[PDB]
Design a protein around this ligand. Sequence first.
Ligand SMILES: O=C(O)[C@H]1O[C@@H](Oc2cc3oc(-c4ccccc4)cc(=O)c3c(O)c2O)[C@H](O)[C@@H](O)[C@@H]1O
Ligand SMILES: O=C(O)[C@H]1O[C@@H](Oc2cc3oc(-c4ccccc4)cc(=O)c3c(O)c2O)[C@H](O)[C@@H](O)[C@@H]1O
Ligand SMILES: [Ca+2]
Ligand SMILES: [Ca+2]
Ligand SMILES: [Cl-]
Ligand SMILES: [Cl-]
Ligand SMILES: [Zn+2]
Ligand SMILES: [Zn+2]
Ligand SMILES: [Zn+2]
Ligand SMILES: [Zn+2]
Lengths: 524, 524
Amino acid sequence: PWELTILHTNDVHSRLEQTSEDSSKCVDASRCMGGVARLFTKVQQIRRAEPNVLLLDAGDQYQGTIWFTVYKGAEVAHFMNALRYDAMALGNHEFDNGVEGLIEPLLKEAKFPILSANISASGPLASQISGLYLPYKVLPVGDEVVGIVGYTSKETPFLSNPGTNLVFEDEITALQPEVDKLKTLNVNKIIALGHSGFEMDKLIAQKVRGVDVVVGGHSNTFLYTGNPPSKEVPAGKYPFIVTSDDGRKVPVVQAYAFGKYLGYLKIEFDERGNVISSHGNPILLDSSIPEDPSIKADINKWRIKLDDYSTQELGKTIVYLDGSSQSCRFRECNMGNLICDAMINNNLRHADEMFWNHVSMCILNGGGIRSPIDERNDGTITWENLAAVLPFGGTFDLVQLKGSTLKKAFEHSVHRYGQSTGEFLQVGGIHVVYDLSRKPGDRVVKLDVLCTSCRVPSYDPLKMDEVYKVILPNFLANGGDGFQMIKDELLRHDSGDQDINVVSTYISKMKVIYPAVEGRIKFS
Amino acid sequence: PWELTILHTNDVHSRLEQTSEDSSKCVDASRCMGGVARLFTKVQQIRRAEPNVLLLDAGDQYQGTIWFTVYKGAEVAHFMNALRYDAMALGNHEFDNGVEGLIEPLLKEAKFPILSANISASGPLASQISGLYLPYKVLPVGDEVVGIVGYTSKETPFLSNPGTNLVFEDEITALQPEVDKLKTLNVNKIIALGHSGFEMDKLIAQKVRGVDVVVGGHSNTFLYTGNPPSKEVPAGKYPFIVTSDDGRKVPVVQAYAFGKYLGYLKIEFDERGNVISSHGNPILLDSSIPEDPSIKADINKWRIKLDDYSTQELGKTIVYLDGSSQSCRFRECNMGNLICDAMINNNLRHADEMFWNHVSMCILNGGGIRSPIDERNDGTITWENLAAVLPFGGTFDLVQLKGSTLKKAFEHSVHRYGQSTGEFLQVGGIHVVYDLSRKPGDRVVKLDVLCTSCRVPSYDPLKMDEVYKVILPNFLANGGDGFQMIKDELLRHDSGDQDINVVSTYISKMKVIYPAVEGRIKFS
Ligand SMILES: O=C(O)[C@H]1O[C@@H](Oc2cc3oc(-c4ccccc4)cc(=O)c3c(O)c2O)[C@H](O)[C@@H](O)[C@@H]1O
Ligand SMILES: O=C(O)[C@H]1O[C@@H](Oc2cc3oc(-c4ccccc4)cc(=O)c3c(O)c2O)[C@H](O)[C@@H](O)[C@@H]1O
Ligand SMILES: [Ca+2]
Ligand SMILES: [Ca+2]
Ligand SMILES: [Cl-]
Ligand SMILES: [Cl-]
Ligand SMILES: [Zn+2]
Ligand SMILES: [Zn+2]
Ligand SMILES: [Zn+2]
Ligand SMILES: [Zn+2]
């Protein structure tokens, strides 16, 4: 048998530095995890021991911390080059800065192929981008070759800013002929590497004839075989075995997110390229693995500009930004309004004639707002100020919730009102009225929401059976602050941009802000 | 006696081209008025006949039409140079584009002195601007000399964007020592030329010892002796005689606005510089006076860039901009919201610790909104589109009104509701609820207004005795659409920026707009 070791990362999301266990800022270094310097160590160790190794990334290196804000992808090229990645698939977040922000710096600077078989361009862009990403790449490994075919979420236009000159084709439709082509070229070992989520990965494994292994991402899916090593709870075994339509067993892998783990899969192939066996597990990148000193030193050098950036003026406020708990856990607060307005602005995507924008609504728990910002420093707002407001390193995600669920969420928001608890909701694109004299669970007396399928945005009563797109913190999507109904009942969930970055971008764009309290939340 | 002819303009406000009788776009040329080409004709004729002539401008050449939007003052320098103005005083609107937008192009390009004795600078700006404007200029006239001392509204920081490195001193305090100084230099004929309004002009005439004549502006004051020649109703005789504290008679003049009239005052002086007699009248620049062909031709050349500019993309809307009468005369409309939001944004001025901004409130009659804008042209908005919405060439002015007055205005807004009349009010910084089943004059059942004297903007009930700053169209400040209570009861009124320009600037700054209908106006 010919044995291949697939090392893989996905959804690293700008975690260049080691992080806390929850992937936020590293505070207690002796317990920190991940980061590229530690990843280097581990990959180097594995490559000393195993002869046939591929190191693959399944997309969404872009977006997640101040590294991406400042270096805009140059950090991704530079550090992925230094780890000698073999291939990367394009993720949705690779389009956050438009096509132009992908082409430079990542496509032009990567020393490894960047792949997606289901993205096509038209017009002058097609000529501009031709060959800068590829449907697949055939790589030599030992004395053999392995074909790697890429794919990207067809929902990318709703989840990033790819523009109107790129078309995201159905993955399976686009992949099959590329895999068929590889077979006619005598390439019998084929990895599908891509960025559409675990559920699509399993459909790819099932339906794309000739794929031997699927390496995925997007959904931040943790898979494990055995006792998990940290706090992440597995969605299934590693690898997850799919029985293909052609009758074969096809492993499917992912490795959570944020660079906390290195996916490690060993595949045995016969001479005809059939998978005989597959076994492995993600490897927790904890502090027992030393950070590579050279990589670390480079990271420390690159940090200097980040530190400088963090105290620069982003924009001005002429109003006090009231992020006090005495306000934001009790009533509409203007910091809440600002943040939810920035969340909707961040989620303006191209729309056809069906809607003015695909999403209009935002919720934000008051417990997520951790500081005010005083306007008396010549009105300046810096990233450092914003990091005090939003200190947890979270994202502002897009979910779909039935109106019933959202009504439950607002009843939860005030179920034990008066105790300064974190669940009280700040809003955008929603007007709510509470009557606190009613019984808990029956306190929402009006709930109106801004339409999307309309040419003129206006408010109408929430409908219990209708599904609404809502932007909200990943902390709430995951059931935090007691919002178990959101976790348990949501119909779709895609991770969004970094919290601080969302707000900082909105402030920069607006230049001078003046959020008011305006009656989004009232009490009878 | 030595006889001087003072020709004077004020508040020309970018009326480079001849205009209609109401100073809007010229439609029927054979009846149009004003413009610099006609002004040239008349000034040239007067200078052929009278030996001792000064041509003076009392400020506010800046701001008013697309000429200023595009040429930013270069048109003012160029055309004022071509008419060979002798001096100009700085107006409030000369600071609309900041100090930098005054220095270049106007101060650096004018071939005549630009004056103000009550503006001082500090810091690096003092060295930058030194001598580019002057407190006064002594001009030779025939074999004599005349001193001209300038002044500018001390309210300029509330009425434009002069920045924080200029201090606007009380006019009388600043003027007296400059006039005293001129007397010690043997200059016994002194004109005060400046831009503070007719009421301050009269106080200057009364209190500044040694001023022989006051030539003013700002208040767009029409003075006439006899039967008026057009539709403007005189505020008093021309000149208006003030009896000075030193016992002399001091003429005070102004000449309306918009270049419709040329002020013409003949002063006889004795050998000691005392005014023996003063008589005159503004001259209506109607079509009986031909436009100078060379000036006209130059104006036509300069127009080309204006025409080109008018169809360029200013920004995008992703929503339909509903400026239909069926909406805006009946209920809250999103075009209304947009325009009032642009009005408040235009009126952000520097604030001390007393208020987040000096003004928070806007009203706009639905009758002032004359077209929607469709978002289906790739979302583009052009100046030409905006000119369809706001076709009258008006301004968005700042007034002070008691809450009682404003309540009367909102009762008027719905007094005969249901007939598609123009008086229905669109709002910003105000939330109103009507009950149309109540009797006319008693239909306003709630009226809440956004605070100014607060660090966090929020809404509180209107107070009948409190005075509120409000931004609104000059058409309403003048009692249009039946709002006689606004005209009759307002406590202060200063003219603002051009309507179209206000909106175009806000759109350009925002880039992508999406105004909603959000409950600013409701019905019980
Ligand atoms: O610590 C506090 O003072 C308050 O903490 C609140 O809990 C939260 C914890 C939270 O923890 C995280 C989090 C924490 C550690 C690492 C990563 C993420 C993110 C949040 O947005 C978050 C939040 O929004 C909360 O409201 C509780 O609701 C509240 O009862 C408590 O007072
Ligand atoms: O002409 C119409 O269709 C409507 O005209 C309305 O009157 C207005 C006239 C107006 O005239 C001017 C104006 C007109 C000519 C020259 C300069 C300015 C400016 C306005 O904003 C303005 C306005 O806002 C109005 O509502 C009346 O309220 C309304 O009854 C009528 O239907
Ligand atoms: Ca195979
Ligand atoms: Ca005198
Ligand atoms: Cl999924
Ligand atoms: Cl006045
Ligand atoms: Zn991701
Ligand atoms: Zn993704
Ligand atoms: Zn003026
Ligand atoms: Zn003025």
